[PDB]
Every structure is written in structure tokens, then in C-alpha cells.
Design a protein around this ligand. Sequence first.
Ligand code: CL
Ligand code: K
Ligand code: K
Ligand code: K
Lengths: 411, 411
Amino acid sequence: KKRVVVTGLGALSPLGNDVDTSWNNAINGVSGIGPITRVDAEEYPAKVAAELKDFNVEDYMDKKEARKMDRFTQYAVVAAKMAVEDADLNITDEIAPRVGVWVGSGFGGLETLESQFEIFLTKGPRRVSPFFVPMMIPDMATGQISIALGAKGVNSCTVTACATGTNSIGDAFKVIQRGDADVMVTGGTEAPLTRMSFAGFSANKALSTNPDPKTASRPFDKNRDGFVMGEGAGIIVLEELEHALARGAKIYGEIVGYGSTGDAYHITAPAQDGEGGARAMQEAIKDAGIAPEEIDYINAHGTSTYYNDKYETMAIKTVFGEHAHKLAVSSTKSMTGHLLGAAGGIEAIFSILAIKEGVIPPTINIQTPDEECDLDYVPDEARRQELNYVLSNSLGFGGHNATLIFKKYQS
Amino acid sequence: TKKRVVVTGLGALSPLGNDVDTSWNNAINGVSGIGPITRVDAEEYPAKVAAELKDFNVEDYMDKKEARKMDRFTQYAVVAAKMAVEDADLNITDEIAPRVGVWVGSGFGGLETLESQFEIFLTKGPRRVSPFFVPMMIPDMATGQISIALGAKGVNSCTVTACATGTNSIGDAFKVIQRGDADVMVTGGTEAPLTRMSFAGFSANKALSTNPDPKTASRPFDKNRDGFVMGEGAGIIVLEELEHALARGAKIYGEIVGYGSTGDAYHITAPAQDGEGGARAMQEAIKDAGIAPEEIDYINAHGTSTYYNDKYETMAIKTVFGEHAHKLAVSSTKSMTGHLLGAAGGIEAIFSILAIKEGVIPPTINIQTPDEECDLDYVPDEARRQELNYVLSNSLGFGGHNATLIFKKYQ
Ligand SMILES: [Cl-]
Ligand SMILES: [K+]
Ligand SMILES: [K+]
Ligand SMILES: [K+]
């Protein structure tokens, strides 16, 4: 099995238009949640969202190129280019067939579908854009990243709702472990702030209807009432260890475990007691070849829904036993909102940086303790601590449980 | 870990029949599944033909109340997955549920549901959007509903890679079992792309054939080919670790031995010059199988009936196989089924597996005018009875997604 290390990071999030800004805001407990501006909030019971601020795609590419990309693809291309530049990786003709791309999205180009369907209704099918299909489909983030980078290796796109970013990174990790690529540009992207996405997640009451941006996203709080929707992309460069060392790459950490399970229960409701999530964490722990007590910090899925936070806490207790009260847990969705398909990507970046910088980001907004959510959620303030192992969960709608384990890099 | 992986069950819905036996017997008899479009009114579109399911009434498989909560792409996936598990005679007992996973992809997911729910949003407002809209529309719902129906609690995912979807999904499921992470995987592809926006979109970028004659519309490798004919359905197989299949007395159709994945990194929709990416995917699959190229007896081509796919796929076969390119047999079953998009790789994996099990190569129908650039042996018009040892199946998808599988006769 090959060892796989993290050599580059790239991100766009409601906390900043690069990794450094996003991470610095996360470690200082800054909220990225504000009033909805992308759509007319009057039409929905949800009133807040976590949007990108001050993002001008034309700062990264020509207007003609950006006009042929839905926002989810624009975020993926920008974050992937940022990650490859951070990695100082030169994708030459010689290495191109060994550099792959595995970036997922939960929804793909929903904004493009909506605008093009309105054109179909008013102008007819003969006025639908020739670019409609490639712009909408979720695999276009990987497709456009591959063209932008000249990456000709293993190529895919995972679509698993909230688990998308975590599954994509895990799948890319497995490609490198088995020797099928030397480098993988991987993660998740999402631009879900659209009319249908707000209508859909309001119709099934998943979104918080709390109009106060100061308290809307409050994972583990007794008064939590649903998630706050966010947007962005989190992309990392995974690389085979010997390949990284030979080119003098900087190494942030090592990816060592990946677990994937299904609840086989319900289309949207998480399984009772978090049994599926517990099994995914146990599979990742076994994959890493460690004891559960070796985990220092869990970057929780922690979406601020009643059932997720309760069941994820139960799953942590099942897996860790007495150690559940010794490790630190935090939900960075308290600050970023739920980035859906990009959540696992941004959270893998925060998990990797927590190890590299020795800082645990906090869960903000816990004002009322919930007796069912009684672990150490690192409330309010970041904690400076040397970390050896970090576990990140994505317990997605539809029963998709995905877990990654990261380790401090040791020669 | 390198476990052997065998095929123990097949399930399908295609324009050639509502089960595997009917679809297979029609394919080996050169029966065309193409006719006039009935799903949408084709008067306003330039494409006039399609390959639809015949006499498929979902109420024959489930209650109307259950069907109403599933988009057609999920109905096809659940029906084909249940037929595959019944064919495999697999009882997912308690100790086996966490070792049985699902990896089924779709290129578009619930596009019909998205169009109808957005039209409701526009005309009636967001309160009329169904609470089931989001789960019904997302492509990962095929895996999600199959997992619930079967009680499969193991590794689960959904790949979305346009035309390569079904082939990537099976390859990825094969890798899960090969590395020891599941004992059984229910995998393949599903698609219900006969919708207003899909026809409008593939007409707008001229990918579809505008040929109104169903007798000649899909004619892969013919000099007069002019685009693909859209189809629908699902192709699902049961992959199983060998020792497990033997312990439960499973019937074995064949073995999956190689999988290759590459990216063209060229253009959003246009295939790379001379099929270079496709050649690299075939070479990666051959290398993965540990065989010489001369060991391939039959190639189930991607062969979509577009000018550039068929020309470049022929060039890629010559690059990989050299003189052996004129010795092996090649055929495109899309000459009969049309292009099933995300389900193409699933149905084509079933036809590749059955070609080995039954020792019959299905033909390419409708070649009336030889093309000097497409001069390989396309098994024209009539099926060929032949003992096969290795079969290669390609999916060279829009967006530069190249995927190849290699199947082997099981002793
Ligand atoms: Cl055409
Ligand atoms: K709510
Ligand atoms: K997480
Ligand atoms: K094929």
C-alpha cells in the first residue's frame, strides 16, 4: 500500500476566498452567516445563509470562460488552481497521466437548470443553450478542473449529498494507495443557493427558520432547529509519499483512514442512535490501524439539525466509550453553515490545518446545553493543542456515512 | 489486499426488454429498440427517434403510492437491482448486511422531477414544492433507495460521469471488493433521460442524430452516421468476493479483472484527437488485468454513432492492439439499444458478461455504407457464436471521462 500525503490546499468559503482567510476566521470563531442575498428571502421560511463575500470570478479567469461555467464549477476551478499553486506542483506532459481529479458536487448546476428551463418555457427548446448540458452536470467540475490543470489520470465525480466531499477525498486516497495515480486533486464543490434548493429544503423543514444570523447555526445547542445553507469549495492535493519527497513538496499531514457505510433506513432521516455513523467511524479506525483512543479531535458533521447532532453524539459514545469524554469534538458548521457537497472538502482542510498548526477550531453559538449532547464541543474559543490524529465525519441525507482520518506527518 | 471478484447476478430494464433474458435474446437476434419518440412531443425538437422501454408499467413491481415517490431513474434502478439480487439468489442475512454495499450511478438523476417541480414553483409558488423533491431528484437516490429495499449496509456511493457512469460505478465497486472492504456490491447505472430539457440540450449542441428514420438512425461505424440516439433503462449486477460466492453456492457468470480510468483534459464535449485518452484507459485496464493486449477476444465498443466517437474509438483500438486490432471482434450494441447515457456502461457490462457466459458476440446492426476510417471487424448484422476468454467494454464519455472494464471467463 502506498502512503498518501496532503501537499496543497485550496478553498472558497463563507469565511474567506482562500484557505488562510477561511482558517484564520474559523480559529477566531467568526461567523460566515448572514441574511440571504442570492435569492429573494421573502418567498421562504429560511432567512439566513452562508454566502461567499466579495467573490469576483473575473479575478481568476476571463469573463468569457466564467460565462460558460455554473457557479459550482467556477468555485471548483478556482479552488483547484489555488490548491495546485499551493502545492507548487508542475503538471508536465511527463506526469499528466499520473495526476487525476476526483471532485464531487451534491447538486451540480442547479442555477443553470433553473435559468435554462425558464428559457425553454418562454423561447422554446430551440433556444436552449448548446452549453446547457455540460454546464449543469455535476461531473463538469472534475471535467473543467482536468482541462484547466492538464490532469490526465484517474478521473471521477462522486455525488452523495452531504457526504460528497468526504467520499471524494476517500476515493482519491484509495486510488493513490493502490498505485493508480501519483497525485489526485480532490474534494467537493457546491453552489446550492438557488430557488429550488431553498424551496426543497424548506419543504421538508431541514433548514433552520431562525431569522437571527447570530443564533441560526448552533450545533449541539438545545434550541437548534435545522441547518443553515452555505456555498463554496474545498479542494486538496493528495500525493503518493515518495513522489512528494522526490520533488521537495511541503507536507501538511497524512491521510490514513477512510470508512463508508449505509444506514439502509430512510430517504432523509438518520438512523436511530447513529448506528451507521458509528460503523463508518469504526471502519475508518480499522483502516488506519489505530486504537480509538488515538483520536484527539473529531471535526463533527454537526449540521445543527435536531437528529444529526443527537445521533452523532450517540455514535461517538458508541465508538469511543470512555474516550468520548476525553477527546475534543467541534462543528465548524457553526461558522460556515452546511456546504452540502463541499462540506467534506472544507472540513478536511480544517482537520488537516488543525494538525499542522496545532489548533482546534471551536463550535460557536452553544448558549443552551442539551442534556443529550454532553460531549466537549470546544465552545466559543479555539484551543491550542498538539494533535496526532483527527477524524472528520459527513453523515449525509440518504444514509451516506463517510469518515476520514488524518495523521500528523512523521518520516 | 487483492481478492478475486466474480459476477453472481444480473438485472436490467432496456429498450430491448424488461429483463435480462429478453434484452439479451433480442440483442443476439439483432433486434432494434429504436422507434419514434413518445415520451415527449418531438414536433418542436430536431431529434425524432429514441430507444424507450416497451410496456414498462412500474405498478407491476410496486404500489402506485411507492412509485409516486420515485423519479423514473430510481424506479428503473430499484426494479433492476431487485431482479439482480433475485438472480443471484442472495439473502442479505444480519452478519452479511454490513458487508453488502451499493454503488449505482446516474448521469442526470431525477431530471423529470426537477423540471416538473420547478414548473410548479414558477406557477404555484414554493409552498407547492414537494417535501420529497430533493430526495427524488438527486442521483444518489438510486443507491439510497436500493440500499433501503435490500437492507445493504456496506460501502455505498454514486458516481456521476456522464456516458462513463455505469462503467466507472462497476469498476469502483470492483475495487471496493478487491481491497477487502465489502463481500458483495450491487452496482451499475440507471438513467431516465427522455425529458424536455435533455432532448433540448442534446439537440442544442448537435450531439443527437436528427435522422427521422428509426431503421437507420443508430448506425455505429457507418459512413453516414450523424449522432447518437437517446435511450433509457438500468443495468445492475451483483459483484461478489470469490470465496464468499463459493461458500454460499452462488452461480458465477464470469470474473471482473481489469478497470482503467483516464481523462482527456481537452474539451467540455469534444473527444480528444485520435482517441488518445481512450487508448490510455484501455491500456490501464489491460495492465490492471495483468494480460497481453492479444488476450482480448471481443470489445463491446462505446460506439455511440457520432462521427468523432466512432472514428476516434477505432483509432484508439488500433493504437492499443496494433496488428491484433484486425484479429479481435468489435461491436456496438448501441446500434440496437441506443445510448443509455449513465446506464450504458451497466447494460454493456451485462452484454459483455453474457457474451462470455453464452459464447455469443452480439452484432452491430445497421452498417449499410462502409467508412474507410472505420475498417475493423464490427460483427455486422448477425451474432457470432464463439468461445470467449476476455472481453473489454469501453465508455468514452462526454467531458473527457474514459472508462474501461475487462471481464474474464470463470473456469
Ligand atoms: Cl448530430
Ligand atoms: K426546521
Ligand atoms: K466533518
Ligand atoms: K461498451
